């Protein structure tokens, strides 16, 4: 969610992702801890049995067969962490998330409460206004002529710079806003 994706996944990445998926589904099948540990050690042995195959074609064939076996033997109802995309609390608190710009529309009577908070907010807004043009200039310099090729962004490099395009990442609402 945080890292910029690459153009493709490598063979090692696919093997590791299959290993994690297989272990998770095996834990879903093996509810008890000791049984899961036993069969997970067996699965790890089965995985590292073919770790030293120098023929890449045979390696991809083995990966293909393993993925077919996984799809046949997957748990139809695997365990999902409650806040994971399939969980029971996945987007539960999205209705409580309010963007910060709404605070600009508060009536002055509402802003009369919380004076110090709004003074700090004004300081942050001043910082963003002072940093924007330098961020844009740094992005203009660091970008190759044929446009960017990845979604990775550079850090700040100068004396008192800020990493470009930082406002909406830094001022995230919260994970439990209200």
């Amino acid at each position: 969610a945080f890292s910029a994706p690459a153009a493709y996944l490598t063979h090692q990445q696919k093997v590791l992702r299959l290993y994690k998926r297989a272990l998770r589904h095996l834990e879903s099948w093996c509810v008890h801890r000791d049984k899961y540990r036993y069969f997970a050690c067996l699965m790890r042995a089965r995985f590292d049995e073919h770790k030293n195959e120098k023929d890449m074609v045979k390696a991809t064939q083995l990966l293909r067969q393993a993925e077919e076996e996984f799809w046949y033997g997957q748990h139809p109802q695997p365990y999902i962490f409650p806040e994971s995309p399939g969980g029971t609390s996945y987007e539960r608190y999205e209705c409580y998330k309010v963007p910060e710009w709404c605070l600009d529309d508060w009536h002055p009577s509402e802003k009369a409460m919380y004076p110090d908070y709004f003074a700090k907010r004004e300081q942050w807004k001043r910082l963003r206004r002072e940093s924007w043009e330098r961020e844009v200039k740094q992005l203009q310099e660091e970008t190759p002529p044929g446009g960017p090729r990845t979604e990775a962004l550079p850090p700040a490099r100068k004396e008192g710079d800020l990493p470009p395009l930082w406002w909406h990442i830094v001022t995230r609402p919260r994970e439990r806003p209200m």
């Binding site: 969610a1 945080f2 890292s3 994706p5 090692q12 990445q13 590791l16 992702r17 290993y19 994690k20 272990l23 998770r24 790890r44 995985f47 590292d48 962490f81 409650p82 806040e83 994971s84 919260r174 994970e175 439990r176």
Partner: protein, 88 residues
Amino acid sequence: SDAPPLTLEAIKDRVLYVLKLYDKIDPEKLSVNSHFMKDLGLDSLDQVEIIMAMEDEFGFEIPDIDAEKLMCPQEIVDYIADKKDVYE
């Protein structure tokens, strides 16, 4: 009320606690900056198992693209703190 307000020290303590219960890592030789591959001499499968153990410890999932990059306990602690809005 609900769960206490998790702090950075608690996160680091639990991460180190999980790591010292791993039989492939020497407890004394382990520090918060030790690299899994260079310092500790583990391979990628061990790193996947470590990430899964962290997920079980803290009750949430770390996506594969983010989990591949974590290489020392400090990165794990920082990722967990950033995810859970921990600042103290």
